Swiss-Prot record, chain B:
Residues represented out of the complete protein: 426 to 531 of 735
Superkingdom of source: Viruses
Location(s) in or outside the cell: Virion; Host nucleus, Host nucleolus
Protein family per UniProt: Belongs to the parvoviridae capsid protein family.
Note: The ratio at which VP1, VP2 and VP3 proteins are synthesized in vivo is about 1:1:10, which is the same as in the mature virus particle.
Position of the signal peptide: none
Applications reported: AAV capsids serve as viral gene transfer vectors that have been shown to affect long-term gene expression and disease correction with low toxicity in animal models, and are well tolerated in human clinical trials.
Function in brief: Capsid protein self-assembles to form an icosahedral capsid with a T=1 symmetry, about 22 nm in diameter, and consisting of 60 copies of three size variants of the capsid protein VP1, VP2 and VP3 which differ in their N-terminus. The capsid encapsulates the genomic ssDNA. Binds to host cell heparan sulfate and uses host ITGA5-ITGB1 as coreceptor on the cell surface to provide virion attachment to target cell. This attachment induces virion internalization predominantly through clathrin-dependent endocytosis.
Protein name, as recorded: Capsid protein VP1
Free-text note on domains in this protein's UniProt record: The N-terminus of VP1 is sequestered within the mature capsid. It contains a phospholipase A2-like region and putative nuclear localization signals.
Gene: VP1
Swiss-Prot record, chain C:
Signal peptide start and end residues: none
Underlying gene: VP1
Biotechnology annotation for this entry: AAV capsids serve as viral gene transfer vectors that have been shown to affect long-term gene expression and disease correction with low toxicity in animal models, and are well tolerated in human clinical trials.
Source organism superkingdom: Viruses
Residues of the full protein shown: 630 to 735 of 735
Cellular location(s): Virion; Host nucleus, Host nucleolus
Domain comment (free text): The N-terminus of VP1 is sequestered within the mature capsid. It contains a phospholipase A2-like region and putative nuclear localization signals.
UniProt organism field: Adeno-associated virus 2 (isolate Srivastava/1982)
Protein family: Belongs to the parvoviridae capsid protein family.
Additional observations: The ratio at which VP1, VP2 and VP3 proteins are synthesized in vivo is about 1:1:10, which is the same as in the mature virus particle.
Function comment: Capsid protein self-assembles to form an icosahedral capsid with a T=1 symmetry, about 22 nm in diameter, and consisting of 60 copies of three size variants of the capsid protein VP1, VP2 and VP3 which differ in their N-terminus. The capsid encapsulates the genomic ssDNA. Binds to host cell heparan sulfate and uses host ITGA5-ITGB1 as coreceptor on the cell surface to provide virion attachment to target cell. This attachment induces virion internalization predominantly through clathrin-dependent endocytosis.
Protein name: Capsid protein VP1
Length: 520, 106, 106
């Protein structure tokens, strides 16, 4: 299209706010190496691994473009503008572009690394719009578009897992060759583009309820309904069984008849940010909340949307019930608590049970007088969905994921991703990119053996993602001011969400969306 | 399904999310409470953050096609899975859709 | 709002023109790394820039009789000519030249 010396695209990184819409566009510079030396390799769990950690799959020589994080499209100022003024938002459509593709040939002679242009090499790009490949987006994987537009990122290697009986495979395991898909070949001067339309999805609840589910009544007027308030009365110098009933008002507000129930629960262990407050033992798995599937235990993380803590208990968080983001420069294994930023889901405690506490109590026997049996109750540590139940989904964050693919199953209930975001039956398709293998010098005699020597090469270029978002404008009638996200005025060595003296971009804290308030 | 619900990730790339991996550290010759967090990859694939959960369950008693493997008692009703309706117990048969057995337990 | 250093005060002055070289990453690792790229191919750019400005003139309409002061070069011989290059081809501006040579009544 543009041969050698003509640009095939421009840098478009910006956002436009027009009424009930905001269109965010981002451009990044990517680098794509050669993966697996142009080979597909069967991968599996190491021998000696536990049964829960056993897996089987395949590693492909392809890479994929991931922009399933809000920081890839929204600047921190854009996020503050979104969350301080809107009661909801949802994606509408997206546009994707690859351009200014350069293939570089790398040679190494006598310890010298020489890089030169390869104007005749191609890169293969295709979008899995029919969803025939395992969808690895939406698993909170690294390799996304960096939040800072000036950062250059490596394209992550694509790989998938299939059915496994231990470290081995079964007959139902599926193998996928990505070269069996039609792909577009791009030289220097060719560009790739495609457009996608999001399906209709609910607006994200970017608000916190200003009412509690157990405080929805009028405190001035008594109820006309009666509740059992007493079970005995003083008789002589002993007691005698006698049922009495009262109408509930403000003084006994806990006994009022109600129409709704708090959302479902799956209890998590409570851990404290203050280290000394925790038990002096290794309980990251023994005390962990797990689900059992085909004989293997998987960690429930973050699980059903539940409040991190109750009133005046901000130091407590569920063991695996909240998203934990790493600070800039954080390592991979066994980093301290000061190296991570733990999110808080306290805005949903109005309708959702606290993660570390029981849902409630139920009767377990039948009380009877004169032998006599006293009424007994048990804690409900796990509660399924009941009719009349209301709940709020997990909050989304600037560093958090945007969407996930709803699994193709016969049944599912409330297919909102548990990690947060929008559940899509047809999510944005995976975009697979790889360098076309260029064989090295062949033998002058024919050999039926497949080629194993190739010219070392990588590719670099620009990627553009433009997403149109629909806004749900706030229409509140509260009198007093609301909570808004704000920067702190006091002086500091570094400004938040900027670069330091090393030019390293950092995100100091996770920012949610639930700052405005709406009545229940 | 050719994929399992707990194996929907990319085994080559680590997650950017952290999970509580340790709850104490060696201190002196004893132990001291200390929270640590790790990013989940392929080696600790069971700890990866996930978006979905397995379907509902209503546990059934396990019986074996090999007779000797079963308990030598009459448990077709005492050990049966039942629902209670208007004071009468009805057998739950076949009940909610659940896998008959796990790997290598046909 | 006339600039104190001299010139024309503009609420919307000529916009800043920003130019930079697009970073070209060097050879990447065959294994994925989430760290941002720190190795690049060293490069610079060269080219030509053109600026064309149209100026409006206010013609002098004086009625004075005697001649006015005008800026002029000095006729006497010199080693170097003013506002030219020397034997090293180095261009120099020997003195500042203002604009206030013609005269007008108050």
């Amino acid at each position: 299209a543009d041969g050698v010396g003509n640009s095939s695209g421009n840098w478009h990184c910006d956002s436009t706010w027009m009424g009930d819409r905001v269109t965010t566009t981002s451009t990044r510079t990517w680098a794509l190496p050669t993966y697996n030396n142009h080979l597909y390799k069967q991968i599996s769990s190491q021998s000696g691994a536990s049964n829960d950690n056993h897996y089987f799959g395949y590693s492909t020589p392809w890479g994929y473009f991931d922009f399933n994080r809000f920081h890839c499209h929204f600047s921190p100022r854009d996020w503050q503008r979104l969350i301080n003024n809107n009661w909801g938002f949802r994606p509408k459509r997206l546009n994707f572009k690859l351009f200014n593709i350069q293939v570089k040939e790398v040679t190494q002679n006598d310890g010298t690394t020489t890089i030169a242009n390869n104007l005749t090499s191609t890169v293969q790009v295709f979008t899995d719009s029919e969803y025939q490949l395992p969808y690895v987006l939406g698993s909170a994987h690294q390799g996304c578009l960096p939040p800072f537009p000036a950062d250059v990122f490596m394209v992550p290697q694509y790989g998938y897992l299939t059915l496994n009986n231990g470290s081995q495979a079964v007959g139902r395991s599926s193998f996928y060759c990505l070269e069996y898909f039609p792909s577009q070949m791009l030289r220097t001067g060719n560009n790739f583009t495609f457009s996608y339309t999001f399906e209709d999805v609910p607006f994200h609840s970017s608000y916190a309820h200003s009412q509690s589910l157990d405080r929805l009544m009028n405190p001035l007027i008594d109820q006309y309904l009666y509740y059992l308030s007493r079970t005995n009365t003083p008789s002589g110098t002993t007691t005698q069984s006698r049922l009495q009933f009262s109408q509930a008002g403000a003084s006994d507000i806990r006994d009022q008849s109600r129409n709704w129930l708090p959302g479902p629960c799956y209890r998590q262990q409570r851990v404290s940010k203050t280290s000394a407050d925790n038990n002096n033992s290794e309980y990251s798995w023994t005390g962990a909340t797990k689900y059992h599937l085909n004989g293997r235990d998987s960690l429930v993380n973050p699980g059903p949307a539940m409040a991190s803590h109750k009133d005046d208990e901000e130091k407590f968080f569920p063991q695996s019930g909240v998203l934990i983001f790493g600070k800039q420069g954080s390592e991979k294994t066994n980093v301290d608590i000061e190296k991570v930023m733990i999110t808080d889901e306290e805005e949903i405690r109005t309708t959702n049970p606290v993660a570390t506490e029981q849902y409630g109590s139920v009767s377990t026997n039948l009380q009877r007088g004169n032998t006599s049996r006293q009424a007994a109750t048990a804690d409900v540590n796990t509660q399924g969905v009941l009719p009349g139940m209301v709940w709020q989904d997990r909050d989304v964050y600037l560093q958090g994921p945007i969407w996930a693919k709803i699994p193709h199953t016969d049944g599912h209930f409330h297919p909102s991703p548990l990690m947060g975001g929008f559940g899509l039956k047809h999510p944005p398709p995976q975009i697979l990119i790889k360098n076309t293998p260029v064989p090295a010098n062949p033998s002058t005699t024919f050999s039926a053996a497949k080629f194993a020597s190739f010219i070392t090469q990588y590719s670099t270029g620009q990627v553009s993602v433009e997403i149109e978002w629909e806004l749900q404008k706030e229409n509140s009638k509260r009198w007093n001011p609301e909570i808004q996200y704000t920067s702190n005025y006091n002086k500091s060595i570094n400004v938040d969400f900027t670069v330091d003296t090393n030019g390293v971009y950092s995100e100091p804290r996770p920012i949610g969306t639930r700052y405005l308030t709406r009545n229940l």
